[PDB]
RNA sequence: CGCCUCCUAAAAGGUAACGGAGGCGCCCAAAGGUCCCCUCAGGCGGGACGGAAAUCCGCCGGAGAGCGCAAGGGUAGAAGG
RNA sequence: GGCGACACACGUGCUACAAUGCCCACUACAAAGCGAUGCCACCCGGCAACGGGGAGCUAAUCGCAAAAAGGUGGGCCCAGUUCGGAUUGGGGUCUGCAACCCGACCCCAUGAAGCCGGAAUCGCUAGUAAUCGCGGAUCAGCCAUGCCGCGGUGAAUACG
């Protein structure tokens, strides 16, 4: 939901990190 | 059965009597007193057969056909409209009780509103005991079993016991610690 | 939440008012100005005030926080 | 069967399920999983009966969920009635509990709006 | 201020009689002792009107305890002749009079202030008050 | 304005009056004939949805509950359900 | 302290009404930028954020960059729902001397509202709508969904 979060979905209009976007 | 509380209660429950507590003898001890179960909702005669399916489940669940409660005043009041029926009722005191309870207590008993720490402080004057409850598929056998229904209920215990002494006496002579 | 592990965010004035009566016996309390700081138990009870921009705001400084910060019982505004 | 107290999820697959209980979080699920190997895609209604119980109990023992998380959730409330906290209150002012904006919305916390205005100015406006 | 009343919660019907019975009472409780005179009916009207000086001759207090009841309103008509209606009811509550029933005793200030006082208000009415002790009660 | 309860009515029985506090001109096929059964109202207390009051149990308590609709009388060896 | 105050009422952008919807793995294409006492490849602690180390340029070979929507294949059953974020708590993070009032973010548990909103009121003729996208100035650090800006996809309609 682009508005919440702990998904890749929200978090791109954001631009965080944590274990969710990295590699390694 | 010849199983469970017999070759329980008695064959060790009696030395529990003997040092722990010298009340006296038997027939004159907190053996047990009788076993109740009644039912209470106001829904009914909106078509009647609100009622046709309700009594439908039951008793049926709980394996003995007991009495029934039902209307009063078909009209306005203060506490329902829908016929203003009642509840019923259901009893016994031999094996029978014996049975359906067993499997209640230590196995519908886990599957509860919190394990570590039971209410034993529910608790009359004498002999008496009310508890409030509301469930359908506690029962080990029916589990799940019609969601199409569901509904609340009451049920409480009577005891001979010289007070609510010893019908805690009962509270940890098999479990239910007193809330900690 | 909250950072900095280790040391956090203190005064030096503070490290000393405290240490004193924590030292040769708690006999009195005392009083304080501006704000900002956490708190260690070496003052239980053992609190003053809280002049805020307006005035004063003293309290029981209660444990229970363990060691939290100053936010808790610090405030001031108007209301009704 | 009750993995959680009085508590019954059915006629689905365990991944979803689970998922609607106290401390039931989107991943507590996949460490119950891996260290009890159970395979997420097979449904509740079937499903050999050590999954059935090496989990039921493996969960109701392993911590605290429903109730015991709720009781501790508002025991951090009350507790901060200690002598009145500022994030004490909101609390005990029904009111929003993390800094943010009271010019603005949060009929989340209070509750629909409760209108109730008045001001008469001269008709000019 | 007082303006309210007192007259049985609601309307415990309306309608009574007569007579003159002899009366009576039995002792009292508190320490001086007033008696009444005559057998007839009585004006709750009347006990005001004695309170009045009774308490402002007693600047701090004087303090006193009574015992009586109200019973059942009058008859007499606004003018006409006879019958019943809502008339002569509703502005007259009554109570027994027993030739020398315990209206009042008295209490805290000895025959100084309480003697003259008891007087003034017996000394009022269409009668006498009078002297008391100890007895079997 | 004819009848029903009760005070008035002065203890049998009667007692009037532009006095008093109030009801009826129906309903009923079951509220009717009968053989078996219970107890109440309620007060405290134990308790899902029960704030007096949905409902259930125990101690308690002679009728103040109850009985087609006003009173009175009656009645728990009840007519009462 | 503080105009970032709260009994309510308006504007404007940002989201949820969801099954052309979903979420994971693997995969490919832009322009414009903008890198100095600065952009920081790449491995690793870390489940991760960060943090630790370290080379390029010495500045169009070294930097932000990998990308987005999307392709693939696998997994959902109009249920206010693998929908949804208000929402709270908790535990770590870092600029700053330090973040209660008001920081940003790493992860753990939280699910109102809402099946399209009345009377109404606004852009505009084609790359248009619409959509997915990245960067600028400013800012020590910021909720800047603001504002400047560059492109991946690409309609409809007009008597008068």
Known sequence: GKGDRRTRRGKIWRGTYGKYRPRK | LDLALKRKYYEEVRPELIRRFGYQNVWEVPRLEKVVINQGLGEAKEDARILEKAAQELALITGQKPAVTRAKKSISNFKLRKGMPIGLRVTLRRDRMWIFLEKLLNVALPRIRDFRGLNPNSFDGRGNYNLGLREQLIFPEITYDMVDALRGMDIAVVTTAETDEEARALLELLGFPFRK | PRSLKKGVFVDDHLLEKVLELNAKGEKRLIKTWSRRSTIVPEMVGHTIAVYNGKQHVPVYITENMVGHKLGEFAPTRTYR | ?125 | ?137
């Not at chain 4, 991943?27 to 009890?36: Q, W």
């Not at chain 4, 009635?81 to 010019?103: A, E, F, K, S």
């Not at chain 5, 009916?41 to 207090?61: K, N």
């Not at chain 5, 009586?68 to 002569?88: A, C, N, S, W």
């Open chain 5, 1 to 137: 201020m007082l303006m309210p009343r007192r007259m049985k919660y609601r309307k415990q019907q309306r309608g009574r009689l007569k007579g003159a019975t002899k009366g009576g009472d039995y002792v009292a409780f508190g320490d001086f002792g007033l008696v009444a005179l005559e057998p007839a009916w009585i004006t709750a009207q009347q006990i005001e009107a004695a309170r009045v000086a009774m308490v402002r001759h007693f600047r701090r207090g004087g303090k006193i305890f009574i015992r009586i009841f109200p019973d059942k309103p009058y008859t007499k008509k606004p003018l006409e002749v006879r019958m019943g209606k809502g008339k002569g009811n509703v502005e007259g509550y009554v109570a027994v009079v027993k030739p020398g029933r315990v209206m009042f005793e008295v209490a805290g200030v000895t025959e100084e202030q309480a003697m003259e006082a008891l007087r003034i208000a017996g000394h009022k009415l269409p009668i006498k008050t009078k002297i008391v002790r100890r007895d079997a009660y």
């Open chain 4, 1 to 125: 069967a009750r993995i959680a107290g009085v508590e019954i999820p059915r006629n689905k697959r365990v991944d979803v399920a689970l998922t609607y209980i106290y401390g039931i979080g989107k991943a507590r699920a996949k460490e119950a999983l891996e260290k009890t190997g159970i395979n997420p895609a097979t449904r509740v209604k079937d499903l050999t009966e050590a999954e059935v119980v090496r989990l039921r109990e493996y969960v109701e023992n392993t911590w605290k969920l429903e109730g015991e998380l709720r009781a501790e959730v508002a025991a951090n409330i009350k507790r901060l009635m200690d002598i009145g906290c500022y994030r004490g209150l909101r609390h005990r002012r029904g009111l929003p509990v993390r800094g943010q904006r009271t010019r603005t919305n949060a009929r989340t916390r209070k509750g629909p709006r409760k209108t109730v205005a008045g001001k008469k100015k001269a008709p000019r406006k």
